[PDB]
């Protein structure tokens, strides 16, 4: 199954 993810650089 799927899943959503978020990332931000510091």
Partner 1 sequence: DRKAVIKNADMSEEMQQDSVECATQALEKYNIEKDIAAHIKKEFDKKYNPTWHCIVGRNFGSYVTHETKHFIYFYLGQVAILLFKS
Q: Which residue has the tokens 């993810």?
A: 5
Closest distance to partner 1 from the beta carbon of 1 (Å)? 6
In whole angstroms, give the CA distance from residue 5 to residue 3: 7
Closest distance to partner 1 from the beta carbon of 5 (Å)? 5
Question: How crowded is residue 9: how many other Cβ atoms within 10 Å of its Cβ?
Answer: 3
Closest distance to partner 1 from the beta carbon of 10 (Å)? 8
Binding mask 1-10 for partner 1 (x = CB under 8 A): xxxxxxxxx-
In whole angstroms, give the CA distance from residue 10 to residue 1: 29
Contact residues toward partner 1 (CB under 8 A) are 1-9
């Amino acid at each position: 199954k799927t899943r959503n993810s978020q990332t931000q650089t510091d």
